[PDB]
Amino acid sequence: MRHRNSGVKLGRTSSHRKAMFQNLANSLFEHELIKTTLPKAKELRRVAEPLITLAKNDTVANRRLAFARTRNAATVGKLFTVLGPRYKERNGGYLRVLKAGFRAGDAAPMAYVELVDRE
Amino acid sequence: MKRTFQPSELKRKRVHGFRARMATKAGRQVLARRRAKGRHSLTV
Amino acid sequence: MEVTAKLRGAAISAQKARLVADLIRGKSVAHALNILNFSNKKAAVLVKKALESAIANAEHNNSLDVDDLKVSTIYVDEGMSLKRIMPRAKGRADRITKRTCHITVKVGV
Amino acid sequence: AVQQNRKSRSRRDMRRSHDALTENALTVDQATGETHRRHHVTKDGFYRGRQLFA
RNA sequence: GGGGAGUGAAAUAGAUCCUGAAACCGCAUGCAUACAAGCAGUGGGAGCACCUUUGUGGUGUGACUGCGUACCUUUUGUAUA
RNA sequence: CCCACUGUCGUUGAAAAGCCAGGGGAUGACUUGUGGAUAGGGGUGAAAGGCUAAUCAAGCCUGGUGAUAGCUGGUUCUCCC
RNA sequence: GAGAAGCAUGCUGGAGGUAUCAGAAGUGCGAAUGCUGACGUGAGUAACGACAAAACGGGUGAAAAACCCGUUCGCCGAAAGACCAAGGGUUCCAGUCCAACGUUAAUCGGGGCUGGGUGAGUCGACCCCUAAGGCGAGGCCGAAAGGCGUAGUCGAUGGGA
RNA sequence: UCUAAGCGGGAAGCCUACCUCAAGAUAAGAUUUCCCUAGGACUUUAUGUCCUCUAAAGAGCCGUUCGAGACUAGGACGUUGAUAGGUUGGAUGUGGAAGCAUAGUGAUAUGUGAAGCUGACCAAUACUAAUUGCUCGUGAGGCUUGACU
Ligand SMILES: [Mg+2]
Ligand SMILES: [Mg+2]
Ligand SMILES: [Mg+2]
Ligand SMILES: [Mg+2]
Ligand SMILES: [Mg+2]
Ligand SMILES: [Mg+2]
Ligand SMILES: [Mg+2]
Ligand SMILES: [Mg+2]
Ligand SMILES: [Mg+2]
Ligand SMILES: [Mg+2]
Ligand SMILES: [Mg+2]
Ligand SMILES: [Mg+2]
Ligand SMILES: [Mg+2]
Ligand SMILES: [Mg+2]
Ligand SMILES: [Mg+2]
Ligand SMILES: [Mg+2]
Ligand SMILES: [Mg+2]
Ligand SMILES: [Mg+2]
Ligand SMILES: [Mg+2]
Ligand SMILES: [Mg+2]
Ligand SMILES: [Mg+2]
Ligand SMILES: [Mg+2]
Ligand SMILES: [Mg+2]
Ligand SMILES: [Mg+2]
Ligand SMILES: [Mg+2]
Ligand SMILES: [Mg+2]
Ligand SMILES: [Mg+2]
Ligand SMILES: [Mg+2]
Ligand SMILES: [Mg+2]
Ligand SMILES: [Mg+2]
Ligand SMILES: [Mg+2]
Ligand SMILES: [Mg+2]
Ligand SMILES: [Mg+2]
Ligand SMILES: [Mg+2]
Ligand SMILES: [Mg+2]
Ligand SMILES: [Mg+2]
Ligand SMILES: [Mg+2]
Ligand SMILES: [Mg+2]
To answer: What is an example of a GO molecular function annotated in this UniProt entry (chain B) (predicted)?
Structure first.
């Protein structure tokens, strides 16, 4: 049974799952539009919107939290200079998930993930 | 598992080669048989 | 008058292709092209190739109009198999047949 | 483990009477005029009045 | 891979190429079939469809119904599990 | 490194004898490479009838040979007395 | 037509067939856990071969989860790294192709095709020397075939710039 | 004289009674409510066919999902919207964050301050995604009798 439970498994161990979602968040924050599978895209919101919420207040503890959670100095620098101040006055919902067909070699449902006010 | 073949080329020639078969009478009969049958290779 | 196209020697089995051939039998040519365009099956690509060829033959050699055409006939036959060997446990060996098909499309007004 | 009699060709076709395929939900995006899978981005990156990767 | 064109007496004589059977597998048309229990036929027998004649004809199907437990071998004796 | 005591798994196996977790010996009557010797009623055996090319109360190949079988199976078109 | 069977004819086929009466037989198949080929049912079912692990951006392409480039993540590290002997025999490198082969696709490959590539007085082999063991002029023995052995001559896994 | 006529009592047992299913109960039951009222030809002359017009009530596809679930089926919602995610507040668990200052030779301790962080919970909130749609389902529903009109 699975009553009222959150989270996914996606065929991985706990640590592999954590690493993969962290990698996805870093790639998204760099390129601002990425293509993934739809089940991976819908769980990325739950990982990547809290980081933007955190980057809205630029203190040393917040930046050290963001580095413990991203382990990427370029991402921490982009969050507290670009992405945080861009969404300072938006109340959640900083991403956008859009169904985009199926993968050729796989027949897997795919999706685009993009930032809201990009370009 | 260790299997039975275990190749060595010197031992192949010394047990089965042309000069081994030519050094006895029954080997010369093996060679006569194999020439009468028309084999394209006389020995190993 | 029906215009024909044949695709002989497709590298799929006839049982798998007959499922896609049942989906477009008797429909208008544009609707069938849409169905084949938005399919995730592998047989859809081969069937779309044969249907495109039949439409081109109908319009070039016979000089017909395309919005009036229909998928009047379509059927799948079996081709010749390829025989292969698959080693099994304890020294046993199985025989694998790799199957083939022939698709035949007939487009008409 | 295994059958005692072969299956008639009629009972083999009766089992396959649930093996048929269905169509998808396709719509016309008269913002762009093309056919596309409902609720999906089109082949060139259009959805509900927006364009990705211009 | 095919469709036209062209060769040839002939191309379902086109190179897996004379003839091209059967098992097996499709597509099309007609009839039957979703309240009824078994070696799937046989004796009856309504209806429908198509040919034909002015039919007490022909072809296909077969609602309903009586009867009815494969073949070979070996055995005193086999639907025989 | 050589071995193979227990258990789960595997038994159309990843494998015609294994994996995994434990287990024994580990300077000796040890383990191992290369080359050689012993050949079938024979060889070798700290001995289980063990091994002698996935074959062993007598190896494999060819011949005698189409061995023999008071046994099992099979035996093909039609009609009449 | 009582039967094994016969006769006529439409279509296909494209070069042989054969009365009557005699004659000779590889003269008739449903079974032999019969023999050879082909095709079914099971069923689009089990499985896709170590539980070290992936993600994204770009490129090329008809098509990219798997190829190339980049940025991250993870695994081995007395081995899953480097090197010889044995064995194999071109698998090595470049260009080009994707039918079959590769337990999926492949633009990739130890796959197909077309070219190229191994340079020694000092490394090794050959060479000189011998062990076990083999062969063995004469010789001894044995129905034949043959067996053993002296002088010798081979034979490295050991000695010799 | 309990039986022949007639009239009785009598058990955790039987039928009911309690819970759940149940009209494929082919005899396929009932009740409330809702929807459909266009034209031409025509002959195999009858629930006959053909061509334009029409497409309802509703159902499904699709999407956001669930205390429902192997796949299904079933429940809720799809902008006139709180269906899911996020955001904001709360609650809970852990137990005294980082930086700085002070005391100490130092390990460390104290203050700032029950701080910082906090899956799945409660409440609000259109910020993101639930679309512009498509398919199916028709056009008054044979006959014979008998009652009411
Ligand atoms: Mg939930
Ligand atoms: Mg999986
Ligand atoms: Mg760990
Ligand atoms: Mg093997
Ligand atoms: Mg059929
Ligand atoms: Mg012909
Ligand atoms: Mg032919
Ligand atoms: Mg009935
Ligand atoms: Mg029955
Ligand atoms: Mg008996
Ligand atoms: Mg008996
Ligand atoms: Mg009887
Ligand atoms: Mg039985
Ligand atoms: Mg072990
Ligand atoms: Mg010890
Ligand atoms: Mg013997
Ligand atoms: Mg002896
Ligand atoms: Mg004997
Ligand atoms: Mg015999
Ligand atoms: Mg015969
Ligand atoms: Mg036969
Ligand atoms: Mg037989
Ligand atoms: Mg099954
Ligand atoms: Mg299953
Ligand atoms: Mg499976
Ligand atoms: Mg693998
Ligand atoms: Mg170690
Ligand atoms: Mg190595
Ligand atoms: Mg190479
Ligand atoms: Mg392939
Ligand atoms: Mg090559
Ligand atoms: Mg030399
Ligand atoms: Mg000698
Ligand atoms: Mg001599
Ligand atoms: Mg020498
Ligand atoms: Mg040496
Ligand atoms: Mg909160
Ligand atoms: Mg801490």
So the answer is: structural constituent of ribosome
